[PDB]
Symmetry: D2
Subunit: 115 residues, 4 copies
């Protein structure tokens, strides 16, 4: 599993559960092509988006539907979604964990790249 997404709720101090995540890969004509999607689990995690074979070098975009999450909690948010755009590899494939720390008017995003 080369790509994992994790989402935290900073208001409740909990995993952000059932958050939709859409992954896109940048095509040769500079457009965003749908690549993978899912929703975070009870632990706020999303695994099995892709495989090592399919996760080739290139620019990827991870969109996290933060607005719908806050809407379900009855809390007015600022952002439409959180966006994480990055180049897969320098490098030689390894494991990418993208984490998103959510607040209604702020978010932090981190990348842990491990062997």
């Amino acid at each position: 599993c080369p790509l994992m997404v994790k989402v935290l709720d900073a208001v409740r101090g909990s995993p952000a559960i059932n958050v939709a995540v859409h992954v896109f890969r940048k095509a040769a004509d500079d457009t965003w092509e749908p690549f993978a999607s899912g929703k975070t689990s009870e632990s706020g995690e999303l695994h099995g988006l892709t495989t090592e074979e399919e996760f080739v070098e290139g620019i990827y975009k991870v969109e996290i539907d933060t607005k719908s999450y806050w809407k379900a909690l009855g809390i007015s948010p600022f952002h439409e979604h959180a966006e994480v755009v990055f180049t897969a590899n320098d490098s030689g494939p390894r494991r990418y964990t993208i984490a998103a720390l959510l607040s209604p008017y702020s978010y932090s995003t981190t990348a842990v790249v491990t062997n």
Copy 2:
């Protein structure tokens, strides 16, 4: 000034100077149309992107070109850029300050909205 962007370097503890910023607005046909652009000053701030008249209701994307910034400092960062996507002025005109806190493998973004 209804839209301001501020960028901080969390490695040096200093304003992030000369950071390129591109702003887009979502058109009726669902495409991102160029809206405004500029670079942060010596104080890490970018003003004068737009006017109250031109800053109508809509969905805006603020793209902060973080990769270029880090590379010039000799750092190969994770993200291509920081993205901040939000609905603006849907309850009348407001003033928006978008701040970004930059690390090579992480960023935080905040919004302060005033009436």
Copy 3:
């Protein structure tokens, strides 16, 4: 003004107003001695804590009373307070801006140091 504190509310996207701040300095006997205190203004900022003359070299602790802030807004937060502990002026006098970004179960803190 060599020491400034700024506090942001990440739930409301606004300055955190009337937040109590206590500053301490480490004495030669290793105890924390009261150095200065105040509360953030309507802009979320606290100035005039000290002077260049009184702000000598040493280890300082800035205690930001975040729990009291959240409770008044009807929120039971995780942290008692945010702490920021740092050596100051060990390479000559500097100006320090300490910022805190507050969420109920998370905070970020930054420092901008200028000569």
Copy 4:
């Protein structure tokens, strides 16, 4: 395991390994009494600090020696250490994960409280 600490390096996008962590419990006379300590593992995690039996309600302080971490990497940091001060329980015991996201001049800290 009622108390877990996790430390991330935001410059390298990696677990922060071999970071010293000291835990204190607030005594009746308002002093900090040493309670538990350790160093983060290769995964940047510290488990087995305490037991459910010993981890009674009260105020705790988790000190993360961030300065020594950056020093070993040859990077000049701002903070002496990161401090996380919190009340264990409202509530009825459960699991506390304290995470710290480290940059040389900034840190974020989060709490995930789970059943």
